[PDB]
Design a protein around this ligand. Structure first.
Ligand SMILES: Nc1ncnc2c1ncn2[C@@H]1O[C@H](COP(=O)(O)OP(=O)(O)O)[C@@H](O)[C@H]1O
Ligand SMILES: Nc1ncnc2c1ncn2[C@@H]1O[C@H](COP(=O)(O)OP(=O)(O)O)[C@@H](O)[C@H]1O
Lengths: 371, 53, 371
């Protein structure tokens, strides 16, 4: 037989067998339900909808979002999603493979315990594992040491990994991910005051986040150009309906990462967090990390982040020593890709959970057995 | 038989009654030149940042 | 000299010098024009009409409504209104005073820029300011911290203010104000099917909103009483013409605030919005706000809102901690009153805009200079 991996890194959800280059297909983890009396009697009433099916159907559906802050909000909804994904995309039965789970690090045990409990009981599945993002990120990026930044749909990360080991004290974990940024966007957008608030309306922004964003090289200087020029300003359509045209409101958005005033918090930002977390970690290693600096997924997609990051580190580093960062093309997929690699090696046969343990001891097994 | 006061007043009225045209003309046109400043609200941001790290 | 404040919080419009207890008089901001051939040749034709003059004249006039959703729709009409108000009520010349402007928060810059541009150019006026509602609401209510709910004629608000500072991220802003509710009313009213739709006909409802409304204590239980009793039902005249008598249709109306299905939207309502916006804001402050809870203006006039609100918070709060709300008598005036206080303090002499700046820099000045 053969081995199968779910990505539940948030945003669209990624699933695929070991050794395929890329997951078969991918789904937002939107969940949505009707909003109005069902008045075509000819229609079959289905009360819950998920995935691109919903993405089409959206308008009378209204959304629930089953993961806040990387924490999965409502289990039975997940179970709906999960079941759908297996049967509809995968045409797969729980017995068929070991299955591998993808976790925010340093987050409450409950997600571990219920996830495993459900999936061994509700699904019945040969072998289970839950793995921390950064490990995959290294394996895919193939440098045994490193530090990773990956700010997905969900909670945003700093982990230094040294070759072959964790520094769990070193690690920083942040709820700054693009969704909340986007919801700040609206509080921007009312300046131009084309204005709409609901969940689907919020996801419409996601497209603009694809298309229209780019990273500020320098904030002051950008403001000076903002006074000078309109090339900074670009014209974009409603997905249907109007043309819309957007100024500094594009570039201002990512700066939140550097300055989370605009929705206001203190953690001194991605880069200062990173250098902080470095200065926690010990002295000699540091050069390697100055060399090996790695980024991935949802926010990183933006053009230019790596450059201003390097500018920031050149601010904070003693300039004397080499600095560079890695910005691979495929970052948003990176995790599941690494998961595939993770699946490949026979050592997990030593390492998987088996049904037997789940019989003989509880969810408690995990927290010893896995990281 | 004609084109008249009566019809012209009809058109006039309808014009007055059509909210969509006049409101769209003012709001949508004026929406586009909306913004230019180095915000003092952002001055707050910068100052806080200075205090931040 | 002396200092003068316009309220342009929507609904009737409120204007008065610093230190008077209440504005001299107040006007709806209706605008209206003829509908029919003018057939008394003896009559002078005036093509636009405003204020109680129109309120008398209405029938052949037809209304335009120059503020949607708190956003002022058509500038030159405003200018008509504004000019009229000064000269006819106020007997005032633009030079005579500093003038203070009253704004929905978090709404498009354009209102700022044109308002100032016009009023410095078209009127020529010593000093200008635009101020956010909640600030006044606190000053009048005199508790330096707080959260305010004021759902006027126009767009409906949540702002927590802490003492001396803004939390602009915290803030929620909603188009749920009583006008749209009233227009829903007609879609109710056709059940009894005495039915009329035009603008003046819609304003006739406003009287009923004065007289006939009261807040549901409990919705289910009210329905049970609705089955039992007719004391719930009261008898009311046309302003002229018939007696009309109204059932649950009265109390059902305010529930929209709690459930904006009936004209259907999702934002989980006043109270759930409030507690949401709290749970955004940080942990320690919260008790104060549990203590200090403040409401004002158009919707709040209804008897009973505060009670069911408290019921709702007792639902959502951990019961352990004190809760109360403030419901002052004067809420509908509150804003302009606070504005008077705001006018009083010499610090605005430090703070006003002056003509000089408007000379030396554009409307752009405001958005730095004011909140
Ligand atoms: N074309 C794009 N450009 C920029 N950001 C995007 C694009 N497509 C998706 N994103 C963002 O990337 C994230 C996708 O989820 P993901 O990065 O997988 O989160 P997680 O790390 O929790 O798995 C979301 O924040 C989404 O809005
Ligand atoms: N007697 C009353 N009872 C209940 N509501 C009223 C009464 N009089 C006026 N209102 C409503 O209160 C609002 C008056 O405008 P206002 O509250 O000043 O709005 P804004 O907050 O935009 O200034 C309108 O919605 C009006 O219909």
């Amino acid at each position: 037989t053969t081995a199968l991996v779910c990505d539940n890194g948030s945003g669209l959800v990624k699933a695929g067998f070991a050794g395929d280059d890329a997951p078969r297909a991918v789904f937002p983890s939107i969940v949505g339900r009707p909003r109005h009396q069902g008045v075509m009697v000819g229609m079959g009433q289905k009360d819950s909808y998920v995935g691109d099916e919903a993405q089409s159907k959206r308008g009378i559906l209204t959304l629930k979002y089953p993961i806040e802050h990387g924490i999965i909000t409502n289990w039975d909804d997940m179970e709906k999603i999960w079941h759908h994904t297996f049967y509809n995309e995968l045409r797969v039965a729980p017995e068929e493979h070991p299955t591998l789970l993808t976790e925010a690090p340093l987050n409450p045990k409950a997600n571990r315990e219920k996830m495993t409990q459900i999936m061994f009981e509700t699904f019945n599945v040969p072998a289970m594992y839950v793995a921390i993002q950064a490990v995959l990120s290294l394996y895919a990026s193939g440098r045994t040491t490193g530090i990773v930044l990956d700010s997905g749909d969900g909670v945003t990360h700093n982990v230094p990994i040294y070759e072959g080991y964790a520094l769990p004290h070193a690690i920083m974990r942040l709820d700054l991910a693009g969704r909340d940024l986007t919801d700040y966007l609206m509080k921007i957008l009312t300046e131009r005051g084309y204005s709409f608030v609901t969940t689907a309306e919020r996801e419409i922004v996601r497209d603009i986040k694809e298309k229209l964003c780019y990273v500020a090289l320098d904030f002051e200087n950008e403001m000076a150009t903002a006074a000078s020029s309109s090339s900074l300003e670009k014209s974009y359509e409603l997905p249907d309906g109007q043309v819309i045209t957007i100024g500094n409101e594009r570039f201002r958005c990512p700066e939140t990462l550097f300055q989370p005033s605009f929705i206001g918090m203190e953690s001194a930002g991605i880069h200062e967090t990173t250098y902080n977390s470095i200065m926690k970690c010990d002295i000699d290693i540091r050069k390697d990390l100055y060399a090996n600096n790695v980024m991935s997924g949802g926010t990183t997609m933006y053009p230019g982040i790596a450059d201003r990051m390097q500018k920031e580190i050149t601010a904070l580093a003693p300039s004397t020593m080499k600095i560079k960062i890695i910005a691979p093309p495929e970052r948003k997929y990176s995790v599941w890709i690494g998961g595939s690699i993770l699946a490949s090696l026979s050592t997990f046969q030593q390492m998987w959970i088996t049904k037997q343990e789940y019989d003989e001891a509880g969810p408690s097994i995990v927290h010893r057995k896995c990281f | 038989x004609x084109x008249x006061x009566x019809x012209x007043x009809x058109x006039x009225x309808x014009x007055x009654x059509x909210x969509x045209x006049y409101x769209x003309x003012x709001x949508x046109x004026x929406x586009x030149x909306x913004x230019x400043x180095x915000x003092x609200x952002x001055x707050x941001x910068x100052x806080x940042x200075x205090x931040x790290x």
